[PDB]
Amino acid sequence: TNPFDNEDGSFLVLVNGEGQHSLWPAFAEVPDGWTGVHGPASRQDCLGYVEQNWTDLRPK
Amino acid sequence: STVPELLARQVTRAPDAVAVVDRDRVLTYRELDELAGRLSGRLIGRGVRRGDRVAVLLDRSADLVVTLLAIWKAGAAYVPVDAGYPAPRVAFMVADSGASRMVCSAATRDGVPEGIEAIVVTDAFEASAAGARPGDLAYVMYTSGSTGIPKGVAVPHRSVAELAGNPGWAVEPGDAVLMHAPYAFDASLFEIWVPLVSGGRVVIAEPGPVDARRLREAISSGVTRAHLTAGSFRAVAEESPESFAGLREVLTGGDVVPAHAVARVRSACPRVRIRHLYGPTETTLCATWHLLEPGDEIGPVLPIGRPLPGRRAQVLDASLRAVAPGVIGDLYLSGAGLADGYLRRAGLTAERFVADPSAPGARMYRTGDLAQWTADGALLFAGRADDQGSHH
Ligand SMILES: N[C@H](C(=O)O)c1ccc(O)cc1
Ligand SMILES: N[C@H](C(=O)O)c1ccc(O)cc1
């Protein structure tokens, strides 16, 4: 199972300088240029955070 | 960059070169630009503003090329709808993309959904352009992948231009590219925009499917490059591979293409370049490719190949670590060409357009496919991750 699809995984939400959001498996080092803004939390919780807070896909 | 900016360089360089051939209608570069400018003025006059989505419901034709460029010149993004789609599918695409207007023809006029302004392309505003910008959306193309749920892939101008202007296409002013793919699918980016940013011409195929006989006729009339879906390529390769003779390059991709089909074409046509393309709508037509030069023979396996110039690929395991060659892992695509995401679906975007551990602040697209590297850095396809039940 791909780790981004693991419903039993622990996840972060990350945001880059352009305001783009990414789910991220909590076991992996956070890539350079990205900041954790939510989690560790369930996969579904992270999707809810993104849907609520990322309202314009356009890079800032 | 933007495709209109790249096109403008060609209009300046050779305004009287042929841009579009449609039956007996021939448009030069300058004529195409002027027609699109007039239709852009009409669109602005109907209230189209920067960032708007404008649906398009047209048969392939010179008017279609004019319309897409006009939408772009008005600062808007096009939402291509196949005139043969059922009405509920059309209604969904228009509503989900947020399009309030649709460009259509007399023949397709009845397919505009209720409540949507129809702009009939064949019907006094003056030419006017707001201008395309690299960060603005260029189009929203719908994909269901292997899910069955259609999502709108929102692609910015910069990504379309990175694809269309890529130096690897090797399309020149003397080239003539056959146009027959649905403009709702992104193979149309090669058939329309690559020749126009290169100085070549777009040859609109007669209505109906392009078969071996029609391909031979198009080549006799001057077509030099043609893309076929994997299914059509496999059929012609096995049935009539000599029908590709005279092309400078044949291209194919989408579904799996077996090496045997490529070998049949090379045997019949030693001097034709054969290019295999791979990539999802989410990363603008293709992210990797494999080119067989004239005289060279394909191995037992046809790679999906190497990343296009300006792109990168990674094969990662379940811990997100890069695997060594000969190891099958998850394929991720990065560098140029990524879509902004899925319109109105930020959560889905955030689980597929993910942070790239190898490039600061950047994203990579999780293809959902499996792949392995060869020892010298090409990629072999290993099936969809959700289809491994078919591999035995
Ligand atoms: N194969 C599915 C699809 O085409 O919808 C898919 C799953 C995960 C992913 O990251 C991309 C695609
Ligand atoms: N981008 C599509 C796809 O999603 O598969 C594609 C079409 C034709 C091609 O040769 C490669 C890719």
Residue numbers in the entry:
A (entry chain D): 2 to 61
B (entry chain A): 9 to 131, 134 to 402
Authors' own words:
In this work, we have sought to understand the evolutionary history of lipid II targeting glycopeptide antibiotics (GPAs), a vital class of nonribosomal peptides used in the clinic for the treatment of resistant bacterial infections and exemplified by vancomycin (Van) and teicoplanin (Tei). Since ANC1-3 domains display polydisperse elution profiles in size exclusion chromatography, we instead turned to the characterisation of an Acore construct of the Hpg accepting A1 domain from Tei biosynthesis (A1tei), which possesses a homologous pocket to ANC1. The MbtH-like domain Tcp13 also exhibits the anticipated fold, containing a 3-stranded antiparallel β-sheet and an α-helix adjoining the centre of the sheet.
To visualise how the ancestral GPA Hpg pocket evolved to select alternate substrates, we turned to structural methods. The Hpg substrate is coordinated by three H-bonds to the α-amino group, one to the side group of D196 and two to the backbone carbonyl groups of L295 and G289. The aromatic ring of L-Hpg is stabilised by hydrophobic interactions with the sidechain of L295 and the main chain of G264, whilst the phenol moiety of L-Hpg is hydrogen bonded to H237 and to the amide nitrogen of G263. The orientation of the H237 imidazole is maintained through three key interactions, two being hydrophobic interactions between the imidazole C5 and L261/L287. A water mediated interaction between E201 and the imidazole Nπ further contributes to imidazole positioning. This Glu residue is widely conserved among NRPS A-domains and serves to maintain the desired orientation of the loop immediately prior to the key α-amino coordinating acidic residue (D196 in A1tei).
